[PDB]
Amino acid sequence: QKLIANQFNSAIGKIQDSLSSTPSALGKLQDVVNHNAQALNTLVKQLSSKFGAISSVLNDIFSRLDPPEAEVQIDRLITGRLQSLQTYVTQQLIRAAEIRASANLAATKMSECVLGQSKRVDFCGKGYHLMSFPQSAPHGVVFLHVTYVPAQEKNFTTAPAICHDGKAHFPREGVFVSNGTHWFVTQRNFYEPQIITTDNTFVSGNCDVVIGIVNNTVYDPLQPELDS
Amino acid sequence: LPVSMTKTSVDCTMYICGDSTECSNLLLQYGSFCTQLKRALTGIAVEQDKNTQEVFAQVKQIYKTPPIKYFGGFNFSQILPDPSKPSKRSPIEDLLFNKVTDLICAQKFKGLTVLPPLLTDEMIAQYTSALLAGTITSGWTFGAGPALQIPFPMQMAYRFNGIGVTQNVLYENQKLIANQFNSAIGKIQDSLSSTPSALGKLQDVVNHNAQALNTLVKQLSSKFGAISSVLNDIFSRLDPPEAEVQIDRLITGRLQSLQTYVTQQLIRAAEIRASANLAATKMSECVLGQSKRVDFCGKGYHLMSFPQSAPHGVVFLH
Amino acid sequence: PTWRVYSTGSNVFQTRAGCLIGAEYVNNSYECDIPIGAGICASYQTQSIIAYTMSLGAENSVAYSNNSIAIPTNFTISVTTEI
């Protein structure tokens, strides 16, 4: 418990420095803000376009020419500006679709990673999922995923089954390993050797059909008690 | 599953004006449409490479299969790389590449060009080979941390327990399961070689892009209400007082056509991005692990999956 | 607009994406910053700009055998961000 607590505290301590030091970790939200600002600024700047007219200012056009020519000039300007507005609206609709997709993904992630534990690989982090915590950021969410990663691995010699008294034994929930001399049964994700007994093995058939079976002994807990 | 789309670039001046300078001078007076169009096309181009990176570049290291290829009776010859051919591709990959395929010069002379991808086919093949080596030698352990070796029959026993069937079922039926797997791979190769309509999606993507480019090229033969579809004959046959109307109308028509092209490309890019995201999810949960979701990684109880690369897409064998 | 870079001093490289002038090709392979295309990409280090073929990652080989297994003996808790 103490080691796990210390590791978690160290990770949460380091995450703030990791966020602060790198100035491009929050690039998605900044990209959203920049895209909106650029679209609006471009729409503002389009008002200075002449679009084939004598001038981009309407008052002078009305004050200098007759209705027959002022009409065509202002029609040109009106057409150009309406085209600009329509382009802006279409681009906004496409960006809204993209943001809706991202929001649906965020909702699914908060439902499955924060409100429960997920068995989906690489969905709530890199590794084996434990839990997640949400935080709010301008125009978005930030998930902190806690993950179990194995380390300090060791080699061993394995065997599919153990033949004893003309019977084949298989592990209920573990794997058979050997350190060179003796055989043990251990869980597949953490090394914890144990003595092969009848409690942690089950029998199925004789031992002349399984390729790679290994001779050894299985210790029955009942005999020492009934012999004492 | 399609992953990427063809990257295109468009030159404004050569499309709208061509070889006329006064047309360029007038075009300077219609705003910053070209900056918008170029920016959108560049964004799509970068997004394509991002899609390919997300789908394929998921393993930190490049794993290699052992020199001796014995895996408990399973063959794996039809999906592992072949060292004889220079491209270093599996047979299935070779069929997939050979099954999906002056107009380019005509398009180029009008200002429409195609940019090359960042990742060549050899690099994608190398990534797929690394994924296959990892899933054969290690299992699902290489996607959750360091890669740990485990014999293949024991991996299949674990995957049998994952679907509610005990280990003895595999261990007493090893040869039958191996023979069924080998026959299934052979039938997959034969069926892929025989039927030519299996690769319809990628061909559809390619055809749609080509058709859009052809329509854009053919829009230059329209008059839009002017007196001719060529700028030089308009400028050489009228006075500057009256040529402006014709040139303005032609320019507006061509700008509208090119805007429509850009909008269609944006919508198609959104669809391809959705497909690429689905492909990345499938690579994460069907190849790097075992999935309990029904019908996500095939019809039946999922055991495993193998990736292969195809032109602008991925092929999963479940 | 009259800024041509002639030759030699900036070197000339023929890639599949075009002609590169100003960068020197190197035989090394690095995880690169500025993508150019066709697997060729550039960076800044020597002092000058260098172009190279990007490296996909470190080569690894897993000791596969009929009767060899690897089992962890320790663990690590990791906290990761997703925005």
Ligand SMILES: *[C@@H]1O[C@H](CO)[C@@H](O[C@@H]2O[C@H](CO)[C@@H](O)[C@H](O)[C@H]2NC(C)=O)[C@H](O)[C@H]1NC(C)=O
């Ligand atoms: C398990 O055994 C394998 C092979 O016996 C080890 O892989 C070797 O590691 C050494 C490093 O000490 C290298 O010099 C060899 O080239 C490796 N051989 C192969 C075939 O890859 C592996 O290191 C062992 N595992 C542990 C945790 O020590």
Ligand SMILES: *[C@@H]1O[C@H](CO)[C@@H](O[C@@H]2O[C@H](CO)[C@@H](O)[C@H](O)[C@H]2NC(C)=O)[C@H](O)[C@H]1NC(C)=O
């Ligand atoms: C394999 O593991 C067994 C069990 O831990 C080891 O046997 C013990 O080894 C220690 C080390 O000297 C002795 O003090 C014990 O008395 C041994 N117990 C028994 C029941 O034999 C064995 O030495 C290990 N083998 C190797 C090669 O490390």
Ligand SMILES: *[C@@H]1O[C@H](CO)[C@@H](O[C@@H]2O[C@H](CO)[C@@H](O)[C@H](O)[C@H]2NC(C)=O)[C@H](O)[C@H]1NC(C)=O
């Ligand atoms: C495991 O034990 C069995 C039986 O104890 C061994 O099978 C015997 O091997 C001897 C050879 O020394 C033969 O003479 C016998 O006919 C075999 N059968 C029996 C019932 O004794 C077997 O060799 C041992 N080792 C392995 C790897 O299975």
Ligand SMILES: *[C@@H]1O[C@H](CO)[C@@H](O[C@@H]2O[C@H](CO)[C@@H](O)[C@H](O)[C@H]2NC(C)=O)[C@H](O)[C@H]1NC(C)=O
């Ligand atoms: C244990 O592995 C070895 C290989 O490391 C197997 O021996 C044969 O090795 C050759 C190498 O040229 C392969 O082509 C064969 O496929 C391997 N098997 C056979 C039956 O020849 C050996 O078979 C493996 N052990 C068992 C019990 O299958």
Ligand SMILES: *[C@@H]1O[C@H](CO)[C@@H](O[C@@H]2O[C@H](CO)[C@@H](O)[C@H](O)[C@H]2NC(C)=O)[C@H](O)[C@H]1NC(C)=O
């Ligand atoms: C894996 O399958 C391939 C076929 O895809 C086998 O190669 C064939 O071997 C037979 C020998 O009976 C030849 O007649 C065929 O011409 C071979 N085909 C090809 C494409 O090479 C290969 O032998 C199988 N693997 C093993 C270990 O047997």
Ligand SMILES: *[C@@H]1O[C@H](CO)[C@@H](O[C@@H]2O[C@H](CO)[C@@H](O)[C@H](O)[C@H]2NC(C)=O)[C@H](O)[C@H]1NC(C)=O
């Ligand atoms: C498992 O790993 C932890 C660290 O991840 C090890 O704890 C470290 O042990 C060394 C040596 O005693 C100390 O110098 C460190 O300060 C410890 N770290 C922490 C965070 O307490 C632990 O010893 C490892 N366990 C095994 C069995 O190897």
